[PDB]
Amino acid sequence: RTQTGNNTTVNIIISTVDYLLRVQESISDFYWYYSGKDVIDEQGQRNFSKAIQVAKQVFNTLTEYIQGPCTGNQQSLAHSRLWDAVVGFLHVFAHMQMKLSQDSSQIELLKELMDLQKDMVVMLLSMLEGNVVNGTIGKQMVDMLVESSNNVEMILKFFDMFLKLKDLTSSDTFKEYDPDGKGVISKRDFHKAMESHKHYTQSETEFLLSCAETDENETLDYEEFVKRFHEPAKDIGFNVA
């Protein structure tokens, strides 16, 4: 951050944030390109993967900068342009989590993207390390959250839904719908089990049905379904909480 001995000092910590802001804008523009299109081709799915990997590495670098309660770097990031990058990634996550999850051909992209979300939340926690009551970093982060309230609301609804999925699958109704251990459960069976759950609204029901993938036998593997959707939901939700 500060080369004390040198005559001229360059803030590598802030240059990292500048590159993060540029790669965020690139990812956001590429998302805006693919949002209208129903399907993402192989080339686009590869470009997303490479960009997400780069952003993940940058987030890890920033986390390594700010951990070890390095207060100077914490304040530098707090007053830098990090907040715009984070608020853009929040929008990207909030909309891609509902776009990709519907289609079963971008599960790997969804995994990479929710890993990027985990790293961003980890960086936010590392910023919040060594906090004080009524701190400036807390003020900045709450202002960011207020700005991105809609995106965080959508993300939190997504996580609450896929965390209640576990209780739904642990319900006795589902246990008697699947007395045997195969678990390969029909689409209508899952739909009526959800209707019996009484914890899922109508819109939640259509979203689960859309995100639910079935074979030609019209029967679904709930074990793998709940794995894929619950486990990232669980860990990212824990970090957000």
From Swiss-Prot:
User: So which disease is it linked with?
Assistant: Ventricular tachycardia, catecholaminergic polymorphic, 1, with or without atrial dysfunction and/or dilated cardiomyopathy: An arrhythmogenic disorder characterized by stress-induced, bidirectional ventricular tachycardia that may degenerate into cardiac arrest and cause sudden death. Patients present with recurrent syncope, seizures, or sudden death after physical activity or emotional stress. CPVT1 inheritance is autosomal dominant. Ventricular arrhythmias due to cardiac ryanodine receptor calcium release deficiency syndrome: An autosomal dominant arrhythmogenic disorder characterized by syncope, cardiac arrest and/or sudden unexpected death, often in association with physical exertion or acute emotional stress. Patients who survive manifest polymorphic ventricular tachycardia and ventricular fibrillation. Unlike typical catecholaminergic ventricular tachycardia, arrhythmias are not reproducible on exercise stress testing or adrenaline challenge.
Describe what happens upon changing G88S: In CPVT1; changed ryanodine-sensitive calcium-release channel activity; increased sensitivity to cytosolic calcium activation
Q: What gene name is listed for this protein?
A: RYR2
Q: Could you tell me what this protein does? A: Cytosolic calcium-activated calcium channel that mediates the release of Ca(2+) from the sarcoplasmic reticulum into the cytosol and thereby plays a key role in triggering cardiac muscle contraction. Aberrant channel activation can lead to cardiac arrhythmia. In cardiac myocytes, calcium release is triggered by increased Ca(2+) cytosolic levels due to activation of the L-type calcium channel CACNA1C. The calcium channel activity is modulated by formation of heterotetramers with RYR3. Required for cellular calcium ion homeostasis. Required for embryonic heart development.
Q: What is known about its processing and modification?
A: Channel activity is modulated by phosphorylation. Phosphorylation is increased in failing heart, leading to calcium leaks and increased cytoplasmic Ca(2+) levels.
Q: Where in the cell is it found?
A: Sarcoplasmic reticulum membrane
Q: What note about domains is in the entry?
A: The calcium release channel activity resides in the C-terminal region while the remaining part of the protein resides in the cytoplasm.
Q: What is this protein called?
A: Ryanodine receptor 2
Q: What induces it?
A: By TGFB1.
**Could you say which protein family the record assigns here?**
Belongs to the ryanodine receptor (TC 1.A.3.1) family. RYR2 subfamily.
Q: In which tissues is it expressed?
A: Detected in heart muscle (at protein level). Heart muscle, brain (cerebellum and hippocampus) and placenta.
Q: Could you describe the subunit structure of this protein?
A: Homotetramer. Can also form heterotetramers with RYR1 and RYR3. Interacts with FKBP1A and FKBP1B; these interactions may stabilize the channel in its closed state and prevent Ca(2+) leaks. Interacts with CALM and S100A1; these interactions regulate channel activity. Identified in a complex composed of RYR2, FKBP1B, PKA catalytic subunit, PRKAR2A, AKAP6, and the protein phosphatases PP2A and PP1. Interacts directly with FKBP1B, PKA, PP1 and PP2A. Interacts with SELENON. In cardiac muscles, identified in a complex, composed of FSD2, CMYA5 and RYR2.
